[PDB]
């Protein structure tokens, strides 16, 4: 299609400030019941549609991960993905930057941006990932 496929994921989860400020993940807190979640049309706990935007911590912690040697079609292998827990008590699934056989559970990691896959036009989709701090 000459109307392009996406090159970014996703404006309601990963905030890239237009003035060049550091990107951050964001959640949305239900104003009725207080549930924090990623962006959704209605609160899955109480069905309210009234929210407040909550910027999320850029530091998280690898809860678990796996080195992927046989993965999705079209992604370069090996790659790594993980459950990354944020201190706001939200869990984010994301790729980890780096080499196989180097991550451990409960390791601290920091948000970063990079290509997570190629789109239908064979151009990279840029999204959030996490990387080692030191």
């Amino acid at each position: 299609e000459k109307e392009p496929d996406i090159t970014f994921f996703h404006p309601d989860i990963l905030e890239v400030p237009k003035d060049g400020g550091l990107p951050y993940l964001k959640g949305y807190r239900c104003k009725k019941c207080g549930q924090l979640d990623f962006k959704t049309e209605m609160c899955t706990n109480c069905w309210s549609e009234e929210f407040e935007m909550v910027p999320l911590s850029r530091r998280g912690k690898v809860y678990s991960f796996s080195d992927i040697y046989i993965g999705q079609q079209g992604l370069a292998t090996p790659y790594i993905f993980a459950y990354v827990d944020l201190p706001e008590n939200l869990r984010v699934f994301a790729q980890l930057e780096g080499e196989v056989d180097t991550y451990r559970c409960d390791e601290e990691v920091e948000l970063t941006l990079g290509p997570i896959r190629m789109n239908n036009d064979n151009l990279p989709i840029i999204s959030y990932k996490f990387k080692k701090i030191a």
Partner: protein, 392 residues
Amino acid sequence: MKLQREVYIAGVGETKFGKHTVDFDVLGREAALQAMNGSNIDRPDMIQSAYVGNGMNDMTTGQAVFRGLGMCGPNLPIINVQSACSAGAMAVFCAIKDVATGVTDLSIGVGTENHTMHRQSGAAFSAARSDIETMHGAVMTGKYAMRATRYMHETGATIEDLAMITVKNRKHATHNPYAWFKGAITVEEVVNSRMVAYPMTLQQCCGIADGAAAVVVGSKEMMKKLGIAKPVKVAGVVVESGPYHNRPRDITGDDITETTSEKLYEESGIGPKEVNILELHDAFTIAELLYYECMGLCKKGDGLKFLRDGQSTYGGQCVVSPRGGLLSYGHPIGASGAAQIAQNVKQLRGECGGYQVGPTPKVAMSHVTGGGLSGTEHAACTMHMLVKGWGS
């Protein structure tokens, strides 16, 4: 689901599992015919409803199964069911509900699938890019691998411990003609098989297979009228859907397996320590290991000890995967949940020859899940509790 009246299983049916060159309808019909003949049915239209589970063969699989038995028509309402790997168990569940509620007195559930005859892209076994974890590269083996890594982190389990699940399940299947892979395999062969997503190697993953099974269920009075010698009582059966949220979970647990099994124990009045055999969703070695804890066979954190102590094989508290599991049969999506029930019935009846559990089991439990979009552990879970229903 509470049963409004007693429901019993009469005849069951089961094809060989593996690579078949006959399709899902032929396999399903073979299993249905066996189950009907094993129920001493002389008038096929005594069967008042049929449910058939399938994953991706077609939209009219149950009608395609029964048409070759001459049974389609105004006296056989057929509904096909789907919940990925839950489907075959849900088919039996629907039949049980028809009988328990008095909608019918005799019903049949079939689960059937043929994968290997058909070109299935690979995208059919996965969710769409729309699913957030899939957008970021998730594959099922890596999702379960993360569960294994977390379990090794918490318990000190090694890859060799995980591989012993394949070893055990293939051992159980040694003399089972229905199973596909069977017999002795060494831990080093399992561990040294190709790495898919650490620590899951190829031999720790169930494979795609073709097969079918069927279960006839009926009222107490129907068991007497059919002259069924060893009717198996449905002590309980439970269907759940998986909770969705984005909070940290303990993935060495399993929210829906925990709640489904607890509800099954409460409704049936049978606790987990009373279960003598168990068929469960061993799509990967780590799943069976975690489910020892998730189902309450042992305490939190004790699944590794349970395995190493031999508590999940012959002589132990509960023989887990006595037919060989998905790790020996492979996994025809629509079939497995019905097939677990067929083999548990055969074990309760003492009919499994060289793979028969001794002493004879009296309580048999079965479990399949299925699916799992982002934020869920699984989409569905279906569990059955079956007990000996004949006297002395």
